[PDB]
């Protein structure tokens, strides 16, 4: 499966086990964010705008 | 056949004692295989 982590070998570097994600946990937060809740119920006073 | 029954009871005791005796040896051998691995 692409875009995941794997284990390799010493010299031939053959595959050992397709490891879970390591790229995502390390650099999850650079300048972006995933989905928060902040639901529209908290949004008030701007109903005529929303 | 009553001394046969007594010898059978002795054999039963030996078998019961040998059960865990063999099991302990097998599991300790498994532990040694695990540490060698």
């Amino acid at each position: 499966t692409p875009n995941c982590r794997v284990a390799l070998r010493n010299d031939s570097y053959t595959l050992h086990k397709i490891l879970p994600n390591k790229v995502d946990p390390l650099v999850s937060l650079m300048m972006v964010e995933k989905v928060p809740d902040s639901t529209y119920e908290m949004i008030g006073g701007l109903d005529k705008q929303i | 056949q009553y001394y046969l029954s007594k010898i059978e009871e002795l054999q039963l005791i030996v078998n019961d004692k040998s059960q865990n005796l063999r099991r302990l040896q097998a599991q300790r051998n498994e532990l040694n295989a695990k540490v060698r691995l």
Binding site: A7, L8, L19 | R28, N29, N32
Partner: protein
């Protein structure tokens, strides 16, 4: 004999260790570590040491030539 063998196989050397920081315990009998010079590689975790001090991102010790979790 088996008690002798059990107390004999429990040598595990572990005197001349080196430091390369652990990343995280992915599972038991598998792991991923990052050495001091980088070179992040997947390793095998022995059962001698475990969660009791296996906190996620703490500096750990590794064998001199084996880089294994000690």
């Amino acid at each position: 004999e088996f008690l002798h063998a059990q107390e004999e196989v429990k040598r595990i050397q572990s005197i001349p260790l080196v430091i390369g920081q652990f990343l995280e315990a992915v599972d038991q009998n598998t792991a991923i570590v990052g050495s001091t010079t980088g070179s992040n590689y997947y390793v095998r975790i022995l059962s001698t040491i475990d969660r009791e001090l296996l906190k996620p991102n703490a500096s750990v010790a590794l064998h001199k030539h084996s880089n294994a979790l000690v």
